[PDB]
Design a binder for this molecule. Structure first.
Ligand SMILES: OC1CCN(Cc2ccsc2)CC1
Length: 150
């Protein structure tokens, strides 16, 4: 019973989380997941400030109110070559990655690794945080509060 959470650098407190190497997070699960990192879904303003500090991904993820991809450099297979916070407009489907915002993180680029899941609760799942440099932190617990997300 295992969940892998791949996480990025934080930029003005904003970071990306991909679950189990595939788009697999619902909007309700995303809020609960960020809560386990003492974080919240970023506002569009928080995400724009993270972008300005160097944040970009090539994956759709929730923020408050929308699903987006932050882009700095144009790439034809990432958000159809757009730059800025690209907003998903049309999709049949509901599951994506998530972004999270930690207000206590550093103000600019923080590419140190993540070594804790501070606000998960008691549960049976082995949750493993996987950093980009491969370092891992694991703990037994749960973060999902909605039964339909389990
Ligand atoms: O009230 C709930 C809190 C979270 N737990 C999770 C769990 C499932 C098997 S063991 C622990 C269940 C009861």
């Amino acid at each position: 019973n295992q969940i892998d959470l791949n996480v990025t650098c934080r930029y003005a407190g904003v970071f990306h989380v991909e679950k189990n190497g595939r788009y697999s997070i619902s909007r309700t699960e995303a809020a609960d997941l960020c809560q386990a990192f003492n974080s919240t879904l970023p506002t569009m303003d928080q995400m724009k400030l993270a972008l300005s500090k160097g944040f970009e991904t090539c994956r759709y993820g929730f923020i408050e109110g929308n699903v987006v991809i932050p882009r700095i450099h144009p790439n034809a297979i990432c958000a159809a070559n757009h730059t800025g916070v690209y907003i998903l407009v049309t999709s049949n489907t509901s599951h994506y990655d998530t972004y999270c915002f930690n207000a206590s993180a550093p103000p600019e680029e923080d590419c140190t690794s993540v070594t804790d899941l501070p606000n998960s609760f008691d549960g049976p799942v082995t949750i493993t945080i996987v950093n980009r440099d491969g370092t891992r932190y694991s703990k037994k617990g749960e973060y999902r509060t909605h039964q339909e997300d389990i």
